[PDB]
Each structure stands twice: as C-alpha cells, then as structure tokens.
Amino acid sequence: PRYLKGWLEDVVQLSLRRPSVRASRQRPIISLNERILEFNKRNITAIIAEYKRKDPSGLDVERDPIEYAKFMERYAVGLFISTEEKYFNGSYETLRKIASSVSIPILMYDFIVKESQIDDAYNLGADTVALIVKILTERELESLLEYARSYGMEPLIIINDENDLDIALRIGARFIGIAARDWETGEINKENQRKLISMIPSNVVKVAKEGISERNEIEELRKLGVNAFLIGSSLMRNPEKIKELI
C-alpha cells in the first residue's frame, strides 16, 4: 500500500492481517455496473444503499442486516456492505448472510490491499469490490483491478481528486466512484465532486459516492452524467426514504 498516516494507516495495517475465508460461491456474479446501465436505460433512478453499522463520522446503528437487505432488494440498484471491522463494525459473516438472502448486486466495501480480500469477496457472495486509489500504489491498483476482473467483477475505483482520476484512467478504470465528502478529514466539498465528475470520460460508469440526500440534487447530477448514487447514513436511519428518492 501507500505509506499513510492516522486512521487510514491503521485500517490498512488491519487489512493486511485479515484472515481469508474458504468457501464455495453458490451465487452467480450479478453485475452492479451492468444493472446500473439497465436502470439508466429504463429511466429508473439507480440508488446503491449502504449497510454499515458504524462509520468514522459517528454513525452508530443496530438493525437487522437481512431485513434491511430484503427491503432494499425491492428498490435499490445494489447494496454496498461494509466489512471493515474496527471503524465500520462490519464482518464477513454479515456479508455472507446478506448475499445468501437477496438477488441484487452486492459490493463489498473494505480497504482492499491484498488479493485474498478479493478472494474473500468472491467466496462470500459479493459481486464486486471497491478499490481506493489513495491507499494503493499504481502498480498495486492495476494488479488488483486485473485480479478482480479475472473473477468477472468490475471493481468500483474510488477517487478523491484529479491526481486519483489521472491514475484511474491510466489503469483503464471503467467504473468510478467520486467521493463528495472527504473520507478521512470529513470535509464536505460538492464543488470539487462536480468538477471531478465533469472530467470523467462518457464511457465510464460514474457513481456519486455519498454527498446526496434529496431528489432535486439527484436530477442535477444526473444531467451532469452521474449514473448512480451511493446513499448511506440517511437510509440506515430511515430505509423507506429510498422510495421518495426514486
């Protein structure tokens, strides 16, 4: 990984020693980027719902993951399931349970820094993973993108700035998540998010990664080329909100 500081350095060290799972996938790969494009073609707003029990911001919620997943199966284009343990209170077993219970695409969200975590995602039933430019060397990022593609996954490459986007495009990313609120500092910047979105090629599937909460804001971003919307804490608080958003 890159050399990092603070909690990001911490979570990377934790991820390096994460024990891998042994499990046979008993679930097809259900592609998230493909389903997003299907929703666009049908003019249905494509919301990716997060399940996370905690986050470094101060989210702290208990709710049944299966009930949440089964509810979201009716409305969401896909699910984003946190499996990081220390800051997001996630687990591999929760991912497994959710994946066995619904037939919409699932993205395993974690701090992926080694191949066995992608093995884990596949074996547990996730349909794809996120890779975070800012924690990986370019070589690693390229290698892990190819490794995820070898499973038939198209990973979501998360960018935070123009430097990240340069790297993402150079390694041939076709599915990019654009972070609004900085995930480290917590500083919101919708202006920078829009500027980044405007610099992405039209043949990339674009996910506005958090930073949204209302219907009007979706429509504006939609016009700017955003294909799907990742929404987290507000749906963990009030799942039925997704109905209004779509």
- For the chain, what are the domain ranges? 1-246
- Sign (positive/negative) of CA torsion 163, 166, 172, 173? positive
The answer to whether the beta carbons of residues 115 and 147 sit under 8 Å apart is: yes
CA distances from 139 to 17, 57, 104, 168, 239 (A): 20, 31, 32, 11, 39
Instruction: Write out the E strands in 122-210.
Output: 128-132, 156-159, 175-179, 205-209
Helix (H, G, I), strand (E, B) or coil at 175: strand
Q: How many CB atoms lie within 10 A of CB 182?
A: 13
State residue 92 phi and psi, 5-degree precision: -65, -35
CATH architecture for the domain at 1-246 = Alpha-Beta Barrel (3.20)
Please indicate the experimental technique that yielded this structure.
Answer: X-ray
Q: How many CB atoms lie within 10 A of CB 105?
A: 22
User: CB burial class (10 A; 0-12, 13-18, 19+) of residue 202?
Assistant: exposed
Q: What is the resolution of this structure in A?
A: 1.6
Q: How far apart are CA 191 and CA 25, in angstroms?
A: 41
